[PDB]
Design a protein around this nucleic acid. Structure first.
Lengths: 107, 100, 89, 78, 94, 85, 103, 93
DNA sequence: ATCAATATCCACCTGCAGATTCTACCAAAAGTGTATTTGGAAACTGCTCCATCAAAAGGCATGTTCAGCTGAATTCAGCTGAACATGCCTTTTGATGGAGCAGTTTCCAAATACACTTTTGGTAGAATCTGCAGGTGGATATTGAT
DNA sequence: ATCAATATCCACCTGCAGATTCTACCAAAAGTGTATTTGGAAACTGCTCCATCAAAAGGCATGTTCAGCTGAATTCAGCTGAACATGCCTTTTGATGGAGCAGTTTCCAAATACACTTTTGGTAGAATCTGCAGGTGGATATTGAT
């Protein structure tokens, strides 16, 4: 009988079978339900979609066709929520957001 | 003809814009490697290092120092100053949880 | 006057916000978040929540006050509290 | 209803914080800060309640909510 | 006689091609992405593990995943994540 | 079998520390923040490297890997992206 | 018959610590010495806090330890304080501390 | 109903470090919290240690490294001493 | 500083109400003894990467000079926040039940685990592909002093 | 109002280091069937919890003087930024091996499995006692006038 992957069954790019294995191997619970790896793989794929969206934008405002860490930093930090979610996270080679305190400008 | 000379703070602000625009590491690589190895050596002798281990440490250290400099400057501006001073770093680290 | 007040309240450990206002606010906030349900509250849940909130406010007041004194003042200003909240991240 | 957090109560809190003098606008700022705190914690705690299929917020719900926001409370069962 | 390193790279690239078909990604940026996927994975799975433990349940189900997602993501992000996870689950069971 | 490493926190030069403060948006710099920065950087590296070396020792290795450092950073609340693959 | 706590010279429960390691989803297997070691560490930290806390309770000439004494003991010790730096003790209050500039 | 707790052992330890001193029921609640907390930090770290190294067993070695990573120095020294001491005592008689 | 006069602070006390300990009972948990399995340590080894040296080019750290402007100290006014007394409304404290509802307890269809076998999807190395880094040089600021 | 003097922006260009695609092998997901487990579905209870509803205790809301502080204005010494020349040490690229990370394979000290028996810890009421609600009263601050 012909094989269909659970990723296809769920309509997802991220690998459901791999996520399931990683849940088993991680000692999170004695047992793992069928729907947990689908849900988890979907959530990860969505957040990935959301970061690649904004960072691709940043890459096009910088007239670049390839996303570099700087674009990830711009996307995360300029988005209030991606910034709260990765607020204790450092992006290697990402730099910081342009910000000069006004008091420092000439007057 | 008088030699041209910018006013104190023009070049500083120029550098703020420049480095806030960029993302390269700001400490030299080899001095940083010697620092890392010396500290490690004091914990356990004859350690080796993947080059990416040193790279990771530099990325984290530089991100940490830039961020502490941010908070330090906020503290300096709070006391109606434009110059950051050691008391500013100590206060920022204190509020952050690192000290006292 | 103010010194006695500081020494006295720092020597104590009782909750400093009155219970009924606090619980009224806690339940109101709960109902707002939950889209309007009818959720019950253990007494110990409200007391835990108030212990946490009061300790949070007291410590934010310590930090904010260090910023106050950093500025050469002894009057705590709102911008002292918000700068402390910013530096805590 | 947030005004039930009175001026003398907030003064008490800041006195325990070692504050000598208090600007008159610190009561509004304190009420707003307390409002954001309670919003965050209560959101998480009620979420723990709903997942357990309970309609009563227990102390443990609040303790979990506090622990996962890095604000560990001792003395209520965890 | 050869190591075999798994990674999220092909799937990050698939998603990338869907949101931005003209765009590529430097290997460092991809490393940032893989870091991110592994990070959120362990945050969600960890929180779900605590949820099952708190409720004396030994199975981690999509329900514990859902509550972990609500607890971990800031709102809106959490809503849209819930939409896509629920949709993937209901599609999967048929 | 290599020349002793001494006093290398002085290799963290005055211009590099200034550059870091510029990326932090600092316009003016007191003459004593270079030493203060060197001390803060030293405590930071001591803490992270201490933990990472502990992960090295526990894996019975003589080589600090990037993962050792990533773990050290994560457990000190300073998650780094881009060094696990 | 004697318990594993007795064999290891401990008041803290080795059998219980071991069961909690098994049931906590920490690893597939748990070695014989792991719960002994862990129970010992726990009893040590408890001994240290009860030590300082009794000290603090008697410096206020009280015969019974209450949260206030735990708070004083933990906060006046640099190491107990750094270990419990993100922890709130209910009914413990804060350390007496007035900034000098105010005096 | 059946709630387990560390109260018996905190009371035993208290009686041996200060036989004269007692403990409030709330202070006992604080102690029980402290024990549960440190247990979950050390066991959590031990689990991450065994997993990073592709190990399925948590041994006293993973407990030792976890204690080293988690306790501030000195506190860690005495903890390592007491755990090692307790194990070697347990393994003989 | 000295008193002088006041206003709370802080040890110190009772006696007794309510918190803690003491005493038994017992399901649930720990321990025991016996049998069986297996994760991982050790002893190999192959082959990544790591260390350390070298030299060359030149980029950048260093130490100088020197003056602009910043921080620190000062002085003074006006306005804000503290210290008051008072009575009134909100909060506390106490049942009364009623009821909601959290926990338990038993059972069973639906679910999950797991060994075996069949199949791809995912990887590593290799073969292509091509974005953009670094190199110009000219426009367009921006700055600072005449 | 304007220029000289600097810097920054910005567009264009190429080839090569770094990203994308291609290709086979194989490890790991999927399919299958059977064994094991579970978390609700439904039907029990006692406990906190809330709605009143209530009666009051006591803490706060209120409005005036005033005393001390926050902020503005000002002044000057000296510190730090800017712009130099100088030369050294970082960067780059490659060598020269060697160490040690990582892959296999074998096999026991250490782990799990399981049927029992022995202890233990939790619990609830009784029997003990510790703290604290309050009441001092003299020390220890504070404030004011010599």
């Amino acid at each position: 009988a012909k094989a269909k992957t659970r990723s296809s069954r769920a309509g997802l790019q991220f690998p459901v079978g791999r996520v399931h294995r990683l849940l088993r191997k991680g000692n999170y619970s004695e047992r793992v339900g069928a729907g947990a790896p689908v849900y988890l793989a979907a959530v990860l794929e969505y957040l990935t979609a959301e970061i690649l969206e904004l960072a691709g934008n940043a890459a096009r405002d910088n007239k670049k066709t390839r996303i570099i860490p700087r674009h990830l930093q711009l996307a995360i930090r300029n988005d209030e929520e991606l910034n709260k979610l990765l607020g204790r996270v450092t992006i290697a080679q990402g730099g910081v957001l342009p910000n000069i305190q006004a008091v420092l400008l000439p007057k | 003809k008088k030699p041209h000379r910018y006013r104190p703070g023009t070049v500083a602000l120029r550098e703020i814009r420049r480095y806030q625009k960029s993302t390269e590491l700001l400490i030299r690589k080899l001095p940083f490697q010697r620092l890392v190895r010396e500290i490690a050596q004091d914990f356990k002798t004859d350690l080796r290092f993947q080059s990416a281990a040193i790279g990771a440490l530099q990325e984290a250290s530089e991100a940490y120092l830039v961020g502490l400099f941010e908070d330090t400057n906020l503290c300096a501006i709070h006391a109606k100053r434009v110059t950051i001073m050691p008391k500013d770093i100590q206060l920022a680290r204190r509020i952050r949880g690192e000290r006292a | 006057g103010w010194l006695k007040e500081i020494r006295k309240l720092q020597k104590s450990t009782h909750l400093l916000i009155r219970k009924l206002p606090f619980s009224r606010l806690a339940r109101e906030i709960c109902v707002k978040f939950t889209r309007g349900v009818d959720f019950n509250w253990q007494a110990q849940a409200l007391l835990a929540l108030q212990e946490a909130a009061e300790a949070f406010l007291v410590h934010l007041f310590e930090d904010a006050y260090l910023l106050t004194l950093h500025a050469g003042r002894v009057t705590l200003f709102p911008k002292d509290v918000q700068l402390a909240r910013r530096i805590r991240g | 209803n947030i005004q039930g957090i009175t001026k003398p109560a907030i003064r008490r809190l800041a006195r325990r914080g070692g504050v000598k003098r208090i600007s008159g606008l610190i009561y509004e700022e304190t009420r707003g800060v307390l409002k954001v705190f309670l919003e965050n914690v209560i959101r998480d705690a009620v979420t723990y309640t709903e997942h357990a299929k309970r309609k009563t917020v227990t102390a443990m719900d609040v303790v979990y909510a506090l622990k996962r926001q890095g604000r560990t409370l001792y003395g209520f069962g965890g | 006689k050869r190591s075999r390193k798994e990674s999220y790279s092909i799937y990050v690239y698939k998603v990338l091609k869907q949101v931005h078909p003209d765009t590529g990604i430097s290997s460092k940026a991809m490393g940032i992405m893989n870091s991110f996927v592994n990070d959120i994975f362990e945050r969600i799975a960890g929180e779900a593990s605590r949820l099952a433990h708190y409720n004396k349940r030994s199975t981690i189900t999509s329900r514990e995943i859902q509550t972990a997602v609500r607890l971990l993501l800031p709102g809106e992000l959490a809503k849209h994540a819930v939409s896509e996870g629920t949709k993937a689950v209901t599609k999967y069971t048929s």
